[PDB]
Amino acid sequence: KIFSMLEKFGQFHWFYGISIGQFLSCFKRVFIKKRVDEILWLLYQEVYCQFSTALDKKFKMIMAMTMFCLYKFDIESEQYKEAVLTMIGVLSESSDGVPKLNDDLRYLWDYVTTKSYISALNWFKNEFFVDEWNIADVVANSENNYFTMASERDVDGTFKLIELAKASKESLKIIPLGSIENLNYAQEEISKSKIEGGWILLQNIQMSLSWVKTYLHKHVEHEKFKMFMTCHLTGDKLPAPLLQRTDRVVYEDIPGILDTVKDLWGSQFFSGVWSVYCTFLLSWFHALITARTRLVPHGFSKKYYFNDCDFQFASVYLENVLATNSTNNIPWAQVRDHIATIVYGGKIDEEKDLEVVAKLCAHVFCGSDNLQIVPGVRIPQPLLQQSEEEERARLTAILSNTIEPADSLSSWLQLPRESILDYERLQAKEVASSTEQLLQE
């Protein structure tokens, strides 16, 4: 039954195709770790812990709820099955009714009734499945030496692997792809590392897919040697034998906005004081718009991708504006127009999203005496008699002092709470509908 569910998972997306031998080795891991009821429980726990990391967050929740449903259908009675199916029906807005009453069921009733969709979806994961696997547990407890990792755009797990470079004290060789010189360099370094070892990372193999059709198909137990392949979940279809022969991992983006501000601000190494202030405001605006982008039905109309190239272009524009101004009269309207129209709003074809970007630019680049940039923190303007390093210290101190609230998706991004509640309702509805379609078959 679990393998039928996982095959149905792999039918939806090309990255989730599971092999039979993988499932049998996963079952062997149950006895590897250290009566029939305990074996079955360990089977469910081990299958979830191993095959969750190859799935995105929505499919993680769908898989967890489906395994919980199957195990509680076998173990518990018919009334439990009816109650759980009513919970799924009211989550998907298909069937309505109070549960037939158990602390877990009344906690689930509190979650569903108080419109806590994320809590209702994560209750299964919190209650049943205990162990959770990060990147390091996946890479350490795997006999395979070839790893394929996929993600959406505007996120990249490569620095995380750089963190893993300090986890196991191994040198990571990062290889970009896209040109014939880079292709020859990648082939030479692959041929070197297949003998001398060392961790090799391949960045965004997707545009070299034809070369993947040429080399890796002909190329796919050394010490301290693991090869990592990074691709995109929304990109083109990777070959099935390449996917089956490599351990598949999905990396998930951060849930914080202030972390993005700190990450952008910690890479700006210099320019006077106003350049520092403009770069800080640009980092804040970039973090706010990128956080707003992920709420696809409500925060925007489509799924745009404002990568670091837009940040570089806007930073170059701010540097050119500040350089050609000797009176220290910053043209706030000019930079607002060029950022909301040319830099960030250029790729946007819709008008409502362009208005969203224009409103965000007007809120951020207003250049008032004091800019309450979120409901939390207000930024005063720089003084006329300070050094640049003092300004960096002041801005780092004001980032460290502020605290991201739990409702940062509403207050910091300027969205109504009704929109976020409706987005969570849609997410829980799609999760419960997919789980229902799995359970009825």
The sheet carrying 199-203 orders its strands as 172-176, 199-203, 227-232, 146-151, 247-250
CA–CA dist 192, 212 (Å, integer): 18
**What tokens appear for 340 in the block?**
């909301």
**In 3D, which of 314, 263, 288, 295 has the Cα closest to residue 374?**
288
Stretch that binds another protein, among 79-87, 128-136, 341-349, 398-406 (CB under 8 A): 341-349
Query: Assign residue 178 a region: left if phi > 0, alpha if psi is -120 to 50, beta otherwise?
Result: left
C-beta closer to another protein: residue 116 or 204: 204
Asked if residue 349 binds another protein (CB under 8 A), the reply is yes
Name residues whose C-beta falls within 8 Å of residue 415's C-beta, 6 or more positions apart in sequence. 292, 295, 298, 299, 409
Q: Could you say which residues in the range 178-197 bind another protein, by CB under 8 A?
A: 178-181
Asked if residue 146 binds another protein (CB under 8 A), the reply is no
The count of other CB atoms within 10 Å of the CB of residue 15 is 21
When binding is defined by CB under 8 A, the residue of 116, 193, 301, 341 that contacts another protein is: 341
Asked if residue 210 binds another protein (CB under 8 A), the reply is yes
CA–CA dist 157, 130 (Å, integer): 25
Asked if residue 331 binds another protein (CB under 8 A), the reply is yes
Asked if residue 155 binds another protein (CB under 8 A), the reply is no
Residue 160 CB, shortest distance to another protein, in Å, is 21
Residue 304 CB, shortest distance to another protein, in Å, is 10
Asked if residue 140 binds another protein (CB under 8 A), the reply is no
Asked if residue 348 binds another protein (CB under 8 A), the reply is yes
CA distances from 212 to 132, 201, 240 (A): 32, 15, 12
Per-residue contact string for residues 211-250; x = within reach of another protein by CB under 8 A: ------------------------x---------------
Asked if residue 313 binds another protein (CB under 8 A), the reply is yes
Degrees (nearest 5) of the Cα angle 130, 134, 135?
A: 155
DSSP-derived 3-state class of residue 331: coil
Residue 328 CB, shortest distance to another protein, in Å, is 15
Asked if residue 111 binds another protein (CB under 8 A), the reply is no
CA–CA dist 151, 56 (Å, integer): 8
Stretch that binds another protein, among 87-95, 283-291, 332-340, 394-402 (CB under 8 A): 332-340
Degrees (nearest 5) of the Cα angle 203, 207, 209?
A: 100
Stretch that binds another protein, among 50-58, 116-124, 346-354, 404-412 (CB under 8 A): 346-354
CA distances from 285 to 60, 250, 258, 319, 410 (A): 31, 28, 11, 16, 15
Stretch that binds another protein, among 7-15, 59-67, 260-268, 329-337 (CB under 8 A): 329-337
> What's at 269, amino acid-wise?
F
When binding is defined by CB under 8 A, the residue of 170, 253, 263, 337 that contacts another protein is: 337
Residue 320 CB, shortest distance to another protein, in Å, is 5
Asked if residue 334 binds another protein (CB under 8 A), the reply is yes
Under DSSP, the state recorded for 237 is P
H or E segment to which residue 231 belongs: strand 227-232
C-beta closer to another protein: residue 329 or 370: 329
CA–CA dist 271, 129 (Å, integer): 53
Name residue, tokens 């370094």: 189
CA–CA dist 232, 209 (Å, integer): 12
Stretch that binds another protein, among 239-247, 270-278, 320-328, 398-406 (CB under 8 A): 320-328
Asked if residue 2 binds another protein (CB under 8 A), the reply is no
Under DSSP, the state recorded for 423 is H
Residue 306 CB, shortest distance to another protein, in Å, is 12
C-beta closer to another protein: residue 84 or 229: 229
Stretch that binds another protein, among 130-138, 308-316, 411-419, 425-433 (CB under 8 A): 308-316
Asked if residue 317 binds another protein (CB under 8 A), the reply is yes
Total residues in contact with another protein, by rule CB under 8 A: 29
Residue 312 contacts residue 339 (beta carbons within 8 Å): no
Asked if residue 206 binds another protein (CB under 8 A), the reply is yes
Binding site for another protein (CB under 8 A): 178-181, 204, 206-207, 210, 235, 309, 312-313, 316-317, 320-321, 324, 331, 333-334, 337-338, 341-343, 346-349
